[PDB]
Design an enzyme around this catalytic site. Sequence first.
Site, PDB file in Angstrom:
ATOM      1  N   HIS A  78       0.818  -1.119  -0.162  1.00 56.73           N
ATOM      2  CA  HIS A  78      -0.009  -0.048   0.092  1.00 56.73           C
ATOM      3  C   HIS A  78       0.835   1.392   0.310  1.00 56.73           C
ATOM      4  CE1 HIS A  78       0.132  -0.212   4.620  1.00 56.73           C
ATOM      5  NE2 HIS A  78       0.538   1.147   4.299  1.00 56.73           N
TER       6      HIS A  78
ATOM      7  N   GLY B  47       2.071   6.596   9.239  1.00 54.18           N
ATOM      8  CA  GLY B  47       3.532   6.637   8.868  1.00 54.18           C
ATOM      9  C   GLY B  47       4.588   5.427   9.323  1.00 54.18           C
TER      10      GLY B  47
ATOM     11  N   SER C 179       3.354   2.264   8.838  1.00 49.20           N
ATOM     12  CA  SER C 179       3.017   1.382   7.936  1.00 49.20           C
ATOM     13  C   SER C 179       4.289   0.784   7.044  1.00 49.20           C
ATOM     14  CB  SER C 179       1.962   1.602   7.170  1.00 49.20           C
ATOM     15  OG  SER C 179       2.081   2.402   5.949  1.00 49.20           O
ATOM     16  N   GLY C 180       4.430  -0.397   6.774  1.00 47.67           N
ATOM     17  CA  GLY C 180       5.418  -1.117   6.138  1.00 47.67           C
ATOM     18  C   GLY C 180       6.511  -1.475   6.944  1.00 47.67           C
TER      19      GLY C 180
ATOM     20  N   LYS D  75     -12.883 -11.367  16.150  1.00 45.86           N
ATOM     21  CA  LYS D  75     -13.923 -10.867  16.726  1.00 45.86           C
ATOM     22  C   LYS D  75     -13.885  -9.364  16.854  1.00 45.86           C
ATOM     23  CE  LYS D  75     -13.820 -14.449  20.387  1.00 45.86           C
ATOM     24  NZ  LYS D  75     -14.549 -15.511  19.720  1.00 45.86           N
ATOM     25  N   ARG D  76     -13.064  -8.861  16.826  1.00 50.07           N
ATOM     26  CA  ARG D  76     -12.468  -7.449  17.038  1.00 50.07           C
ATOM     27  C   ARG D  76     -12.754  -6.452  15.573  1.00 50.07           C
ATOM     28  NH1 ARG D  76     -13.528  -8.461  21.530  1.00 50.07           N
ATOM     29  NH2 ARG D  76     -12.012  -9.348  22.740  1.00 50.07           N
ATOM     30  N   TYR D  77     -12.902  -7.337  14.486  1.00 52.27           N
ATOM     31  CA  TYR D  77     -12.944  -6.683  13.217  1.00 52.27           C
ATOM     32  C   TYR D  77     -14.152  -7.206  12.549  1.00 52.27           C
ATOM     33  CZ  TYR D  77      -8.767  -3.788  13.696  1.00 52.27           C
ATOM     34  OH  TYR D  77      -7.766  -3.003  13.925  1.00 52.27           O
ATOM     35  N   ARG D  78     -15.381  -6.868  13.093  1.00 52.01           N
ATOM     36  CA  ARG D  78     -16.624  -7.434  12.436  1.00 52.01           C
ATOM     37  C   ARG D  78     -16.731  -6.617  11.008  1.00 52.01           C
ATOM     38  NH1 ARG D  78     -23.043  -6.940  12.954  1.00 52.01           N
ATOM     39  NH2 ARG D  78     -23.438  -9.199  12.087  1.00 52.01           N
TER      40      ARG D  78
ATOM     41  N   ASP E   1      -0.426  -7.702   1.471  1.00 44.66           N
ATOM     42  CA  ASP E   1       0.110  -6.257   1.622  1.00 44.66           C
ATOM     43  C   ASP E   1       1.449  -6.535   1.926  1.00 44.66           C
ATOM     44  OD1 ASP E   1       0.301  -3.617   1.586  1.00 44.66           O
ATOM     45  OD2 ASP E   1      -0.597  -3.396   3.620  1.00 44.66           O
TER      46      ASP E   1
HETATM   47  C1  LIG Z   1       7.162  14.791   6.632  1.00 45.77           C
HETATM   48  O1  LIG Z   1       6.631  13.664   6.024  1.00 45.77           O
HETATM   49  C2  LIG Z   1       5.420  12.999   6.331  1.00 45.77           C
HETATM   50  O2  LIG Z   1       4.758  13.705   6.936  1.00 45.77           O
HETATM   51  N1  LIG Z   1       5.104  11.869   5.570  1.00 45.77           N
HETATM   52  C3  LIG Z   1       3.968  11.285   5.991  1.00 45.77           C
HETATM   53  C4  LIG Z   1       2.958  11.454   6.610  1.00 45.77           C
HETATM   54  C5  LIG Z   1       1.737  10.698   6.746  1.00 45.77           C
HETATM   55  C6  LIG Z   1       1.834   9.505   6.067  1.00 45.77           C
HETATM   56  C7  LIG Z   1       2.767   9.180   4.993  1.00 45.77           C
HETATM   57  C8  LIG Z   1       3.788  10.093   5.122  1.00 45.77           C
HETATM   58  N2  LIG Z   1       2.551   8.029   4.204  1.00 45.77           N
HETATM   59  C9  LIG Z   1       1.913   7.929   3.259  1.00 45.77           C
HETATM   60  O3  LIG Z   1       1.115   8.802   3.024  1.00 45.77           O
HETATM   61  C10 LIG Z   1       2.083   6.607   2.554  1.00 45.77           C
HETATM   62  C11 LIG Z   1       1.549   6.643   1.054  1.00 45.77           C
HETATM   63  C12 LIG Z   1       1.294   5.364   3.399  1.00 45.77           C
HETATM   64  C13 LIG Z   1      -0.427   5.533   3.132  1.00 45.77           C
HETATM   65  C14 LIG Z   1      -0.907   4.742   4.305  1.00 45.77           C
HETATM   66  C15 LIG Z   1      -0.477   4.933   5.789  1.00 45.77           C
HETATM   67  N3  LIG Z   1      -1.332   4.214   6.809  1.00 45.77           N
HETATM   68  C16 LIG Z   1      -0.813   4.036   7.997  1.00 45.77           C
HETATM   69  O4  LIG Z   1       0.504   4.274   8.350  1.00 45.77           O
HETATM   70  C17 LIG Z   1      -1.532   3.141   8.712  1.00 45.77           C
HETATM   71  C18 LIG Z   1      -2.862   2.534   8.533  1.00 45.77           C
HETATM   72  N4  LIG Z   1      -3.286   1.688   9.573  1.00 45.77           N
HETATM   73  N5  LIG Z   1      -2.195   1.720  10.302  1.00 45.77           N
HETATM   74  C19 LIG Z   1      -2.218   0.959  11.632  1.00 45.77           C
HETATM   75  C20 LIG Z   1      -2.860   1.278  12.713  1.00 45.77           C
HETATM   76  C21 LIG Z   1      -2.799   0.600  13.727  1.00 45.77           C
HETATM   77  C22 LIG Z   1      -2.075  -0.469  13.621  1.00 45.77           C
HETATM   78  C23 LIG Z   1      -1.477  -1.098  12.782  1.00 45.77           C
HETATM   79 CL1  LIG Z   1      -0.608  -2.479  12.745  1.00 45.77          CL
HETATM   80  C24 LIG Z   1      -1.660  -0.263  11.518  1.00 45.77           C
HETATM   81  F1  LIG Z   1      -0.972  -0.770  10.496  1.00 45.77           F
HETATM   82  C25 LIG Z   1      -1.080   2.496   9.874  1.00 45.77           C
HETATM   83  N6  LIG Z   1      -0.092   2.695  10.461  1.00 45.77           N
HETATM   84  C26 LIG Z   1      -0.420   6.340   6.099  1.00 45.77           C
HETATM   85  C27 LIG Z   1       0.723   7.339   6.297  1.00 45.77           C
HETATM   86  C28 LIG Z   1       0.549   8.775   6.244  1.00 45.77           C
HETATM   87  C29 LIG Z   1      -0.479   9.228   6.278  1.00 45.77           C
HETATM   88  C30 LIG Z   1      -1.870   8.450   6.298  1.00 45.77           C
HETATM   89  N7  LIG Z   1      -1.820   7.122   6.299  1.00 45.77           N
END
Ligand SMILES: COC(=O)Nc1ccc2c(c1)NC(=O)[C@H](C)CCC[C@H](NC(=O)c1cnn(-c3cccc(Cl)c3F)c1N)c1cc-2ccn1
Length: 238
Positions: free
Chosen positions: A44, A186, A188-189, A160-163, A93
């Site tokens: 992603h 930020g 993620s990955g 259970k936590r993700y219906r 993913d």
């Molecule tokens: C100065 O530089 C910056 O400001 N850079 C910056 C700032 C914000 C983000 C970004 C880069 N990256 C991106 O935009 C990429 C394209 C990635 C897109 C999806 C990503 N989602 C996640 O991180 C994401 C989604 N769910 N979870 C999660 C929550 C709980 C437990 C678990 Cl186990 C979970 F994985 C995440 N960690 C995400 C990342 C950002 C914003 C919104 N969503």
Amino acid sequence: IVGGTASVRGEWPWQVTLHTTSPTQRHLCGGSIIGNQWILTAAHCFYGVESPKILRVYSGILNQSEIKEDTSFFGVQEIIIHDQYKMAESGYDIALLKLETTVGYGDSQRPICLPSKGDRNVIYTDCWVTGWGYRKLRDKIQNTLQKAKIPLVTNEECQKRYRGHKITHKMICAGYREGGKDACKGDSGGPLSCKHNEVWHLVGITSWGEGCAQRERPGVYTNVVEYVDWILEKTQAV
Ligand SMILES: COC(=O)Nc1ccc2c(c1)NC(=O)[C@H](C)CCC[C@H](NC(=O)c1cnn(-c3cccc(Cl)c3F)c1N)c1cc-2ccn1
């Protein structure tokens, strides 16, 4: 990372920061060194990325402030996305970055072991999620790499936590029933690293969750053990 603490330099030497150059340079995602020209991360992360030419991998970083125009990085030769990947919530993913140059291993940058096929049966009790992501839902990328110890959760409890979602066995979840400690935007990955028999293993890749660190909302991670054959297929091609 929500409810975490600053890492010590060299604590997670496989942790990398993946930056994009388009339109301006910024941190994009986390990732892990798994081979001397291989970074394992989330599919992603490349939504809208039309070319590996805009990517920069930085290893041996504690603080984002270490990165300036003169900071050395690894260019990306190839982005390899699992071809069944549609979206983070549906699984697959997983992505590999083939680096243009070889990582020289040392005390600041080295690989994390992948889980073993025989480790599918093992119970991990010392798992940590790391990254430069948000400390709260609406926040900003952190300068210092954070860490938070998280307990693994069974697939049954996670389902259970993700219906309304289908938690597959190619997914692995982790979290406190009361929330408070988790990955966030930020992160993620990045890795979910688990220590077993004094050896760190890349158990998961931070994939998705509902908000961050919410009560009864485990983090959902790509279950790396289920993709070992896929990783070897792509990294050991003849
Ligand atoms: C100065 O530089 C910056 O400001 N850079 C910056 C700032 C914000 C983000 C970004 C880069 N990256 C991106 O935009 C990429 C394209 C990635 C897109 C999806 C990503 N989602 C996640 O991180 C994401 C989604 N769910 N979870 C999660 C929550 C709980 C437990 C678990 Cl186990 C979970 F994985 C995440 N960690 C995400 C990342 C950002 C914003 C919104 N969503």
